[PDB]
């Protein structure tokens, strides 16, 4: 990586990146392609009261 | 643990609003014990916020 | 590939062994795009299952 | 090697992301044994980058 201001490149590959779009259309492809998706689902009723009693 | 020192990755979420999709960061953060950091980015257009300038 | 992600994750050869007709099946059936991106992260999954199954 | 000199051109490949493009100048490079560099130029906006200033 190349900052501008400090022009020598800087290793950052251990670092542990993270992304988070709730719908995985508005991205542009090629940039897309860079991250792979995981699709956290949508809760049922009867375990979102047993975690909703116990937080 | 297996291939010793230690590497980072790349990877994302996608699922309904409020899910819990940020939530989860901090407490991961606290896990594996990396530094936690955030700066949401939307609806930023300037790219020199994150290349800086020519000094 | 294969050996590229195998010395990337560490695992060997005779303890994670893929049949190529399975790499055929891999292909045939998850990932039929232009790029070799997709199917780069089918198989690293692939490894890594099987690497937290060993570990 | 024909005409003795040596001398050089522009290129520019394209095709669908991920094909190769990034990964093989670099062997290229090694092939020819010219030396190596990369510049980045997504979404940059500023001529100074490629003229300096007036001093
Ligand atoms: N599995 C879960 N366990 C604990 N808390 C949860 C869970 N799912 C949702 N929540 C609650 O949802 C609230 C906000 O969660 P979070 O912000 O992660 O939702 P979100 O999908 O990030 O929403 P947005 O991305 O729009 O902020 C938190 O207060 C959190 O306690
Ligand atoms: N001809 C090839 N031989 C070996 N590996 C290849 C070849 N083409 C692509 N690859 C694989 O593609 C990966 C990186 O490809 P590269 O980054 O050049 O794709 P790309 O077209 O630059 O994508 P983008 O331009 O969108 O970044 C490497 O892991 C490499 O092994
Ligand atoms: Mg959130
Ligand atoms: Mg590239």
Redesign the interface.
Same mark, same amino acid.
């Given at each position: 990586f190349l900052d501008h201001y400090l022009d020598v490149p800087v290793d950052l590959s251990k670092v542990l990146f993270i992304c988070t779009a709730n719908v995985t259309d508005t991205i542009p492809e090629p940039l897309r392609d860079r991250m792979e998706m995981i699709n956290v689902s949508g809760y049922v009723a009867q375990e979102k009261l047993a975690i909703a009693e116990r937080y | 643990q297996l291939r010793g020192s230690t590497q980072g990755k790349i990877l994302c979420f996608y699922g309904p609003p409020g899910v819990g999709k940020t939530s989860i960061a901090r407490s991961i953060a606290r896990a594996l014990n990396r530094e936690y950091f955030r700066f949401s980015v939307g609806g930023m257009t300037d790219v020199a916020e994150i290349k800086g300038h020519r000094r | 590939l294969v050996p590229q992600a195998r010395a990337?994750? *560490?695992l060997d050869e005779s303890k994670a062994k893929l049949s190529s007709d399975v790499l055929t099946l891999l292909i045939k059936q998850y990932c039929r795009e232009? *790029? =070799?991106?997709?199917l780069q992260?089918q198989v690293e999954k692939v490894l890594r299952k099987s690497?937290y199954k060993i =570990?």
């Open positions: - | - | 990337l994750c *560490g232009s *790029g =070799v991106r997709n992260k690497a =570990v």
